[PDB]
Amino acid sequence: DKTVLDANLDPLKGKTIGVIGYGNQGRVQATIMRENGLNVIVGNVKDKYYELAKKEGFEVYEIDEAVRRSDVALLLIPDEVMKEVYEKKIAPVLQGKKEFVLDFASGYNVAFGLIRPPKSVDTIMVAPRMVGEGIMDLHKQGKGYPVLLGVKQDASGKAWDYAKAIAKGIGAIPGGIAVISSFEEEALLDLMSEHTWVPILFGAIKACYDIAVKEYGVSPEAALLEFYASGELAEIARLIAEEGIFNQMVHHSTTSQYGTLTRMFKYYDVVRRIVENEAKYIWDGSFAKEWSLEQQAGYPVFYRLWELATQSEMAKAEKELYKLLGRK
Amino acid sequence: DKTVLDANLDPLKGKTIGVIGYGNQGRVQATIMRENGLNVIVGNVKDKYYELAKKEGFEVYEIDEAVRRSDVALLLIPDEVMKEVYEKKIAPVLQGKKEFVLDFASGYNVAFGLIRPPKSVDTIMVAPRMVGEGIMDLHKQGKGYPVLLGVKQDASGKAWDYAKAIAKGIGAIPGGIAVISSFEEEALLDLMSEHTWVPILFGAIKACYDIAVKEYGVSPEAALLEFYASGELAEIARLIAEEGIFNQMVHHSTTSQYGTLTRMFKYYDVVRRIVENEAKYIWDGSFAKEWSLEQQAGYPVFYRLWELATQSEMAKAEKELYKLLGRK
Amino acid sequence: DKTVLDANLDPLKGKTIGVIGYGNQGRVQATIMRENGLNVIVGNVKDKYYELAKKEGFEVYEIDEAVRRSDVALLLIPDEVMKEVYEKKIAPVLQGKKEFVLDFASGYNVAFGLIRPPKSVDTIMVAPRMVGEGIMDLHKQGKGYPVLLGVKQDASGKAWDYAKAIAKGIGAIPGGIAVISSFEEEALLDLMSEHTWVPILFGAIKACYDIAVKEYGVSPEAALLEFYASGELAEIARLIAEEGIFNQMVHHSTTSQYGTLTRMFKYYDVVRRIVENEAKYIWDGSFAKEWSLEQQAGYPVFYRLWELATQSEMAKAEKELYKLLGRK
Amino acid sequence: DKTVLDANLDPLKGKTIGVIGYGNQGRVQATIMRENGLNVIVGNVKDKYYELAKKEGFEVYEIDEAVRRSDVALLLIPDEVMKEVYEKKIAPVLQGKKEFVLDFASGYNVAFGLIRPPKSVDTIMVAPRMVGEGIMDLHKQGKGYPVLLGVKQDASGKAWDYAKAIAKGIGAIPGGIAVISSFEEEALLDLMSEHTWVPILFGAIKACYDIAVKEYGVSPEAALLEFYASGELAEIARLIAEEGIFNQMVHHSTTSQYGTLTRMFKYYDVVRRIVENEAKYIWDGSFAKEWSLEQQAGYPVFYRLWELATQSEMAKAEKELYKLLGRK
Ligand SMILES: [Mg+2]
Ligand SMILES: [Mg+2]
Ligand SMILES: [Mg+2]
Ligand SMILES: [Mg+2]
Ligand SMILES: [Mg+2]
Ligand SMILES: [Mg+2]
Ligand SMILES: [Mg+2]
Ligand SMILES: [Mg+2]
């Protein structure tokens, strides 16, 4: 019901479009939406990406200049620097506009109020769910891919139309799909993954290694081979994305199935509590405060943790081992 | 003992006075103290208030220029911007002075050390306990009103005299009274109210609504009417300010008296613990740190909480209802 | 919605109506419904009110005599004496009736079974949500006001019609509204207010005073001025009833908003537990037992608590102060 | 300080005095104050005491009649029946008085509001601290005894004088002393003894017996002889009232002193908690409610406890023993 499969592409025809940043995402979106017959430009500072974009056939300007010539803009840059760029270069140029559009690929800076555009602007979001390299690898096959849509400020009653038009312009549909959501329901999701199961998985692996080594006389080389130094995990991820998460286990032994199911239903509430706590810590905006303040301080905890992680015994053992199998 | 009812007004005669800001407070204080025969000026940036003040018959200058011409100054601006104003415009002009006076209406920025004037300056405080509109509504009747006094730095042995003179000049006494206190005993009080019983009251009301609706099948319209959508509370506030807090209940039914008294003496320690915790959190200066850091981050929690509060079910129901009774 | 805005007034025309008690409500409800052209009488014992009632143009009889002449009755007396009056004077006269109506303004004595009329009677409830003095202060403007409706026993299939007719007859609609509810959903609400947030507020204020005085060396006069001796609370109640509870804070400083919101969302569960406990204690009928038993004992706890509250330090300080400001 | 040793006796001369009840107290107070030259009468119902009083030379009337003839009255009857007597016979006769006095020997019924005389009456209290026989046994020697004084309602500015006059009239001073206090400070004291150390002592004795018998094979006769069947406790009480509580132990062995002191300082907080709880339960009026409600039910708990206590194993054994030593 809340799903979309295709839509029109007329509202973007005759209008000019400007892309900010020429990294992976921006490069991909621009290279694609140029094929569908759209006047496109690029805004960026004079660096490597500037030369690359000018080589690939794109007329380039400065950001403030690119926004002047454009009726629509894509702010495809990291969430850690977008704030200053918007405050210094964009907002001034933008106060003197009449009817404009502003698209994002992440709702972090907007959902939490770090960027508050005027009311004369249509604020939208188009969030892909892919790495960026495989995207192009799928467009050559004529395939699409999934995205999320959202609207924060509607001043023309045409926002959703613009969002679906953009979605079509970048090769996401038809072939893939597009879901309608909010700026909050995207940041919340992107952050819950980085906070709940990735670190839990890593800590579980590390603890298994430490226990096996310091309580049962196991050697490091075998622990690493069993846990992650082999490619058993990539196979599982593949079978999951292809056949399903539970149907994947049918290709394993009965003993593994029994143990996995029992221990999954046994430890479900514990992780549920953690997920509740973290989702609550996010929904309120505390994590954004924490991260911004650590930025303003000089990334000391970042530094110390990056150190403690690399100087761990497991990391040294993995270094010695990878050197033995030819892996750089 | 610690109370005052009237005092002299001579030390301010012959001296020039400058008022910073022409908002709610400054406007009133200036308009009044001009009637009592005092050379008064105004300092502010060119905006609406500047036009209003130059209209009402006040000679205006730039802030830095007003302090040069003045021997006394009233810093009547919000506590959230006073710091930069003082650091940039006032302090430079102030190092090259001989004998000066500086008055505040709040001790937040001084009690916690965010503003540390020199030792060649007399630092005082005169804090009213009124809204600002009712003040003028009382001066026309020849009435006064209550204020708090305080001194942080005395370089002339005359501070208290200056403070009482100011109090008299703004029509607080005679007719009202004036209490002597500290910059700390004013911020502490102004904050304990905003941290202990206001939020507790609001949360209790919200919880009553939620419980009544989701556990006893009550309709929202009736809950809102009983709790706050009727002016029952304003009557209680009036009778409290007029006759007293306990003597107010004599006009209620015996059942209400019994229940209220029992449940008040039953839940006294719980709230006492909360009040202790918050007063301790304030006395040390942690809240100032918290608030300043949230300012430096971009008000993310402010934003998210303002959202969560308005998007609550009770707020939507109140919106639907107020629309039905004609209340805009 | 269940809401009602206007209805007919025919079923009461030709019938006679009798009002019991001539206090605030009775004096109010009777005059209005007389203005709308209804044969009305009054029942009361020979006392002060009797003289006033016979003065204002109402033909008076004894209570038992008023019900003989009446086809409808309004039992507008305190809930603490209604029981004996009903048991001695009304019920006997009422066993020998054919088709009757009985209206209440409170569902306390009926919701809990302290009054169980026969099955040959229509039992209803019309509960206003106003003080009683301001009611006429709105009827003079041609305005209405809100009420709650309920039915306990229907013997004519016309109960709701009679209830809406009454609502119209007393000037509640049109201009106000009328909600349909039960005798339980009215007593529960009237009691939850007197048990949850009023006493909590009072205890919080008292605790703030005690702490500030006995742990930070503050003077009583300043504490009283900050907390409630000033009319800050009345303005809050006004803006709440007018603009809304949350939209009210927009007129306060950002610091106050931040602190209030944080501490409200921080202490929400604590008060929720209390509200749950009290609502449960009420829904079962325990409080009715408690209150009916304290009467038979002689109101000892009532007495001792009324004493302890007035002999408190805060009360003595407030007495000394109010005497200093002219407040009687 | 708060002590008194003697005072005048004039205000009671020329006035008539009436005594209610001729039991232990009344028979004494009246008998004495007749010797000091005071017109005295008695009010009581026709029984045993009425015959005794008319025999001893006192003119007797009915209660209601005695108050008509008296300007002062002593309500010396049990606290369990005074309420009805006052409500039926006294209060009516008392509304039509001009200047009257009412004296009590206990503040239970007044401190808790079970008796609320008018404002045209002086309400006082004179509480002895003796059994009633020893009072005469000392008066025969020209000695006094101690009492407590209190005033609840003063309408002539002469109450304290009347109280001291009464004290002198009954032979309490000179020879003894008189303390000034309140009705509350007398009820609280009279009740704390009956709730804290008497029952604790009894329970400790019972537990010692039970333990010694059911865990160490001791015989009942020896346990009873050691604990209380011997009059050692009476000698302890005597030496306490005479020499002091601690100085009493000097006549015991060092081992006893050491053990007693150690275990007293070891178990002090435990009993302190109990005393706090009970004093709080009293100060609020809960015990009055409890006791007034057990009467209306029919004294069931009283009955069952009186049974359980007498049918205990300790009470039976005591029976055989007391029968063996000649003690009836
Ligand atoms: Mg991410
Ligand atoms: Mg992700
Ligand atoms: Mg404030
Ligand atoms: Mg305040
Ligand atoms: Mg009520
Ligand atoms: Mg209410
Ligand atoms: Mg006793
Ligand atoms: Mg005793």
Short mmCIF file of N, CA, C and O in Angstrom, two decimals, chain C residues 155-239:
data_model
loop_
_atom_site.label_atom_id
_atom_site.label_comp_id
_atom_site.label_asym_id
_atom_site.label_seq_id
_atom_site.Cartn_x
_atom_site.Cartn_y
_atom_site.Cartn_z
N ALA C 155 -36.57 3.59 32.10
CA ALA C 155 -37.86 2.92 32.18
C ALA C 155 -38.86 3.49 31.18
O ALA C 155 -40.03 3.10 31.20
N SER C 156 -38.42 4.40 30.31
CA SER C 156 -39.31 5.02 29.34
C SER C 156 -38.72 5.10 27.94
O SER C 156 -39.41 5.56 27.03
N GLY C 157 -37.47 4.68 27.75
CA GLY C 157 -36.83 4.80 26.45
C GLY C 157 -36.65 6.24 26.01
O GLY C 157 -36.32 6.50 24.85
N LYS C 158 -36.86 7.18 26.93
CA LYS C 158 -36.77 8.60 26.64
C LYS C 158 -35.73 9.31 27.51
O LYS C 158 -35.68 10.54 27.51
N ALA C 159 -34.90 8.56 28.23
CA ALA C 159 -33.98 9.16 29.18
C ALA C 159 -33.08 10.20 28.51
O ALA C 159 -33.05 11.36 28.92
N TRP C 160 -32.34 9.78 27.49
CA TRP C 160 -31.41 10.69 26.82
C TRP C 160 -32.11 11.96 26.37
O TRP C 160 -31.54 13.06 26.43
N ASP C 161 -33.36 11.84 25.91
CA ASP C 161 -34.11 13.01 25.49
C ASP C 161 -34.32 13.96 26.67
O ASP C 161 -34.12 15.17 26.55
N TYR C 162 -34.73 13.41 27.82
CA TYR C 162 -34.90 14.23 29.01
C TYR C 162 -33.60 14.90 29.40
O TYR C 162 -33.58 16.07 29.79
N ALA C 163 -32.49 14.17 29.31
CA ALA C 163 -31.20 14.72 29.72
C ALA C 163 -30.80 15.89 28.83
O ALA C 163 -30.38 16.94 29.32
N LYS C 164 -30.92 15.71 27.51
CA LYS C 164 -30.59 16.80 26.59
C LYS C 164 -31.53 17.98 26.78
O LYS C 164 -31.11 19.14 26.70
N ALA C 165 -32.81 17.70 27.05
CA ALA C 165 -33.75 18.78 27.33
C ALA C 165 -33.31 19.58 28.55
O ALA C 165 -33.30 20.82 28.52
N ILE C 166 -32.96 18.90 29.63
CA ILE C 166 -32.45 19.58 30.82
C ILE C 166 -31.23 20.42 30.45
O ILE C 166 -31.15 21.61 30.79
N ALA C 167 -30.26 19.81 29.78
CA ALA C 167 -29.06 20.54 29.37
C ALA C 167 -29.42 21.84 28.67
O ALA C 167 -28.85 22.90 28.97
N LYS C 168 -30.38 21.79 27.75
CA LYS C 168 -30.80 23.01 27.07
C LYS C 168 -31.48 23.97 28.03
O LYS C 168 -31.32 25.19 27.91
N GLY C 169 -32.23 23.45 29.00
CA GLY C 169 -33.02 24.30 29.86
C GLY C 169 -32.19 25.17 30.79
O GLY C 169 -32.65 26.23 31.22
N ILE C 170 -30.97 24.74 31.10
CA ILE C 170 -30.12 25.45 32.05
C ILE C 170 -29.09 26.32 31.34
O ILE C 170 -28.16 26.82 31.98
N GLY C 171 -29.22 26.50 30.03
CA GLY C 171 -28.35 27.41 29.32
C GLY C 171 -26.97 26.88 29.02
O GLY C 171 -26.07 27.66 28.74
N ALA C 172 -26.78 25.56 29.08
CA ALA C 172 -25.49 24.99 28.73
C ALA C 172 -25.30 24.93 27.22
O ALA C 172 -24.21 25.19 26.71
N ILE C 173 -26.36 24.60 26.49
CA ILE C 173 -26.33 24.57 25.03
C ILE C 173 -27.59 25.25 24.50
O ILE C 173 -28.63 25.23 25.17
N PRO C 174 -27.54 25.87 23.31
CA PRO C 174 -26.34 25.98 22.48
C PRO C 174 -25.39 27.07 22.98
O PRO C 174 -25.80 27.94 23.74
N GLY C 175 -24.14 26.99 22.55
CA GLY C 175 -23.12 27.91 23.00
C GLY C 175 -21.98 27.16 23.65
O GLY C 175 -20.80 27.50 23.49
N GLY C 176 -22.33 26.11 24.39
CA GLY C 176 -21.36 25.18 24.92
C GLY C 176 -21.51 23.83 24.25
O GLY C 176 -21.92 23.76 23.09
N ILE C 177 -21.20 22.75 24.97
CA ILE C 177 -21.39 21.41 24.44
C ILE C 177 -21.85 20.49 25.56
O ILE C 177 -21.95 20.90 26.72
N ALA C 178 -22.12 19.23 25.21
CA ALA C 178 -22.57 18.24 26.19
C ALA C 178 -22.00 16.89 25.79
O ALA C 178 -22.18 16.46 24.65
N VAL C 179 -21.33 16.24 26.72
CA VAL C 179 -20.73 14.93 26.48
C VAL C 179 -21.56 13.87 27.17
O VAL C 179 -22.13 14.09 28.25
N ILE C 180 -21.62 12.70 26.56
CA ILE C 180 -22.33 11.55 27.11
C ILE C 180 -21.31 10.66 27.81
O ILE C 180 -20.24 10.37 27.26
N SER C 181 -21.64 10.24 29.02
CA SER C 181 -20.72 9.47 29.84
C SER C 181 -21.54 8.69 30.86
O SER C 181 -22.77 8.57 30.72
N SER C 182 -20.88 8.14 31.86
CA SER C 182 -21.51 7.33 32.89
C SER C 182 -21.36 8.01 34.25
O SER C 182 -20.57 8.95 34.42
N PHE C 183 -22.13 7.52 35.22
CA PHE C 183 -21.97 8.00 36.59
C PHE C 183 -20.58 7.68 37.12
O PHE C 183 -20.07 8.40 37.99
N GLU C 184 -19.97 6.61 36.63
CA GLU C 184 -18.64 6.23 37.10
C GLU C 184 -17.57 7.14 36.51
O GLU C 184 -16.68 7.60 37.23
N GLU C 185 -17.65 7.39 35.21
CA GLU C 185 -16.67 8.24 34.53
C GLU C 185 -16.76 9.69 34.94
O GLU C 185 -16.01 10.51 34.41
N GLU C 186 -17.67 10.05 35.85
CA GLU C 186 -17.74 11.39 36.41
C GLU C 186 -17.16 11.45 37.81
O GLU C 186 -16.37 12.34 38.12
N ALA C 187 -17.55 10.51 38.68
CA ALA C 187 -16.96 10.44 40.01
C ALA C 187 -15.47 10.15 39.93
O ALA C 187 -14.66 10.78 40.62
N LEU C 188 -15.10 9.17 39.10
CA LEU C 188 -13.68 8.86 38.91
C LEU C 188 -12.89 10.10 38.58
O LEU C 188 -11.82 10.35 39.15
N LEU C 189 -13.39 10.91 37.65
CA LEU C 189 -12.67 12.11 37.23
C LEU C 189 -12.65 13.15 38.34
O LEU C 189 -11.59 13.69 38.67
N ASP C 190 -13.81 13.45 38.92
CA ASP C 190 -13.86 14.45 39.98
C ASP C 190 -12.94 14.09 41.13
O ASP C 190 -12.45 14.98 41.83
N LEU C 191 -12.68 12.80 41.34
CA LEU C 191 -11.84 12.37 42.45
C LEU C 191 -10.36 12.29 42.08
O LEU C 191 -9.51 12.59 42.92
N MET C 192 -10.04 11.88 40.85
CA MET C 192 -8.63 11.76 40.48
C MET C 192 -7.92 13.10 40.57
O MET C 192 -6.73 13.16 40.91
N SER C 193 -8.63 14.19 40.29
CA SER C 193 -8.03 15.51 40.42
C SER C 193 -7.70 15.82 41.87
O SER C 193 -6.61 16.30 42.19
N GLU C 194 -8.64 15.53 42.77
CA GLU C 194 -8.46 15.81 44.19
C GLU C 194 -7.47 14.88 44.86
O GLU C 194 -7.18 15.06 46.05
N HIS C 195 -6.95 13.88 44.14
CA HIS C 195 -6.08 12.88 44.73
C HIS C 195 -4.70 12.79 44.10
O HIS C 195 -3.81 12.20 44.72
N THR C 196 -4.48 13.35 42.91
CA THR C 196 -3.25 13.10 42.18
C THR C 196 -2.39 14.35 42.02
O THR C 196 -1.25 14.36 42.50
N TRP C 197 -2.88 15.42 41.39
CA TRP C 197 -2.00 16.52 41.03
C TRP C 197 -2.11 17.73 41.94
O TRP C 197 -1.13 18.46 42.10
N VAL C 198 -3.27 17.95 42.56
CA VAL C 198 -3.42 19.04 43.52
C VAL C 198 -2.52 18.78 44.72
O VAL C 198 -1.69 19.63 45.07
N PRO C 199 -2.66 17.64 45.40
CA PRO C 199 -1.80 17.38 46.56
C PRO C 199 -0.33 17.27 46.19
O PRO C 199 0.53 17.70 46.97
N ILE C 200 -0.02 16.71 45.02
CA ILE C 200 1.36 16.64 44.58
C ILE C 200 1.94 18.04 44.42
O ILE C 200 3.05 18.32 44.87
N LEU C 201 1.19 18.92 43.76
CA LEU C 201 1.64 20.30 43.60
C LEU C 201 1.89 20.95 44.96
O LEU C 201 2.93 21.58 45.18
N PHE C 202 0.92 20.82 45.87
CA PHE C 202 1.07 21.45 47.18
C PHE C 202 2.28 20.91 47.92
O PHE C 202 3.06 21.68 48.50
N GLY C 203 2.47 19.59 47.91
CA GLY C 203 3.61 19.01 48.59
C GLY C 203 4.93 19.43 47.97
O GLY C 203 5.91 19.65 48.67
N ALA C 204 4.96 19.55 46.64
CA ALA C 204 6.18 20.00 45.98
C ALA C 204 6.52 21.42 46.40
O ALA C 204 7.69 21.73 46.69
N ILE C 205 5.52 22.29 46.44
CA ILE C 205 5.76 23.67 46.88
C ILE C 205 6.28 23.69 48.31
O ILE C 205 7.27 24.38 48.62
N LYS C 206 5.62 22.95 49.19
CA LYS C 206 6.03 22.92 50.59
C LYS C 206 7.46 22.40 50.74
O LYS C 206 8.25 22.93 51.52
N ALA C 207 7.80 21.35 49.98
CA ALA C 207 9.14 20.79 50.07
C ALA C 207 10.18 21.76 49.54
O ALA C 207 11.27 21.88 50.11
N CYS C 208 9.87 22.45 48.45
CA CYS C 208 10.78 23.47 47.94
C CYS C 208 11.05 24.52 49.00
O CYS C 208 12.21 24.89 49.25
N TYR C 209 9.99 25.01 49.64
CA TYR C 209 10.16 25.99 50.71
C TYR C 209 11.07 25.45 51.81
O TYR C 209 12.05 26.09 52.20
N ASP C 210 10.73 24.27 52.33
CA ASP C 210 11.48 23.71 53.45
C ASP C 210 12.95 23.53 53.09
O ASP C 210 13.83 23.89 53.88
N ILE C 211 13.23 22.97 51.92
CA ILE C 211 14.61 22.76 51.50
C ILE C 211 15.34 24.08 51.40
O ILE C 211 16.41 24.27 52.00
N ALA C 212 14.78 25.03 50.65
CA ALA C 212 15.44 26.31 50.46
C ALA C 212 15.74 26.98 51.79
O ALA C 212 16.76 27.66 51.93
N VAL C 213 14.87 26.80 52.77
CA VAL C 213 15.05 27.51 54.03
C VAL C 213 16.06 26.80 54.93
O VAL C 213 16.88 27.45 55.58
N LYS C 214 16.02 25.47 54.98
CA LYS C 214 16.79 24.72 55.96
C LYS C 214 18.06 24.10 55.39
O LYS C 214 18.76 23.38 56.11
N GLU C 215 18.39 24.36 54.13
CA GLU C 215 19.63 23.84 53.56
C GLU C 215 20.43 24.84 52.76
O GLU C 215 21.57 24.53 52.39
N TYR C 216 19.91 26.03 52.48
CA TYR C 216 20.63 27.03 51.70
C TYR C 216 20.52 28.43 52.29
O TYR C 216 20.94 29.40 51.65
N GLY C 217 19.98 28.56 53.50
CA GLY C 217 19.98 29.83 54.19
C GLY C 217 19.12 30.89 53.54
O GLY C 217 19.39 32.08 53.72
N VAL C 218 18.11 30.49 52.79
CA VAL C 218 17.22 31.45 52.15
C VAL C 218 16.21 31.95 53.18
O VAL C 218 15.90 31.28 54.16
N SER C 219 15.72 33.14 52.95
CA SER C 219 14.73 33.71 53.85
C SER C 219 13.32 33.32 53.41
O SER C 219 13.07 33.09 52.22
N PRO C 220 12.38 33.23 54.35
CA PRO C 220 11.02 32.80 53.97
C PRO C 220 10.33 33.76 53.02
O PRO C 220 9.63 33.32 52.10
N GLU C 221 10.51 35.06 53.23
CA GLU C 221 9.80 36.04 52.42
C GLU C 221 10.11 35.90 50.93
O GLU C 221 9.22 36.09 50.10
N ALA C 222 11.35 35.55 50.59
CA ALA C 222 11.72 35.37 49.19
C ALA C 222 11.18 34.07 48.62
O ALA C 222 10.71 34.05 47.47
N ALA C 223 11.26 32.99 49.39
CA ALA C 223 10.70 31.72 48.94
C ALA C 223 9.22 31.86 48.63
O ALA C 223 8.75 31.43 47.57
N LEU C 224 8.46 32.45 49.55
CA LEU C 224 7.03 32.62 49.33
C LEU C 224 6.76 33.47 48.10
O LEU C 224 5.86 33.18 47.32
N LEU C 225 7.55 34.54 47.92
CA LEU C 225 7.35 35.40 46.76
C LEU C 225 7.60 34.65 45.46
O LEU C 225 6.86 34.81 44.49
N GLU C 226 8.64 33.82 45.43
CA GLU C 226 8.94 33.09 44.21
C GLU C 226 7.89 32.03 43.92
O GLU C 226 7.43 31.90 42.77
N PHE C 227 7.49 31.27 44.93
CA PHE C 227 6.70 30.07 44.67
C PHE C 227 5.25 30.40 44.36
O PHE C 227 4.78 30.19 43.23
N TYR C 228 4.51 30.91 45.34
CA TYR C 228 3.08 31.17 45.12
C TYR C 228 2.58 32.51 45.62
O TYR C 228 1.47 32.90 45.24
N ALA C 229 3.33 33.25 46.45
CA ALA C 229 2.82 34.52 46.94
C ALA C 229 2.66 35.55 45.83
O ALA C 229 2.09 36.62 46.08
N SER C 230 3.14 35.26 44.63
CA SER C 230 2.92 36.09 43.46
C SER C 230 1.94 35.41 42.52
O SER C 230 1.78 34.19 42.53
N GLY C 231 1.28 36.22 41.69
CA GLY C 231 0.23 35.71 40.83
C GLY C 231 0.72 35.09 39.54
O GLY C 231 -0.01 35.08 38.54
N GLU C 232 1.94 34.56 39.55
CA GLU C 232 2.47 33.92 38.34
C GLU C 232 1.62 32.72 37.94
O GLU C 232 1.44 32.45 36.75
N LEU C 233 1.09 32.00 38.92
CA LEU C 233 0.36 30.77 38.62
C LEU C 233 -0.97 31.07 37.94
O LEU C 233 -1.39 30.32 37.04
N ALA C 234 -1.64 32.14 38.35
CA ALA C 234 -2.92 32.48 37.74
C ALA C 234 -2.77 32.77 36.25
O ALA C 234 -3.60 32.35 35.44
N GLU C 235 -1.72 33.49 35.87
CA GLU C 235 -1.49 33.77 34.46
C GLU C 235 -1.22 32.49 33.69
O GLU C 235 -1.66 32.34 32.54
N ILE C 236 -0.49 31.56 34.30
CA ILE C 236 -0.25 30.27 33.66
C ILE C 236 -1.57 29.54 33.42
O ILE C 236 -1.83 29.03 32.33
N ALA C 237 -2.42 29.49 34.45
CA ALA C 237 -3.72 28.85 34.30
C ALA C 237 -4.54 29.51 33.19
O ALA C 237 -5.19 28.82 32.40
N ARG C 238 -4.51 30.84 33.14
CA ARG C 238 -5.24 31.56 32.11
C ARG C 238 -4.75 31.17 30.72
O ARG C 238 -5.53 30.72 29.87
N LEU C 239 -3.45 31.35 30.47
CA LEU C 239 -2.89 31.01 29.17
C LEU C 239 -3.13 29.54 28.82
O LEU C 239 -3.25 29.20 27.64
#
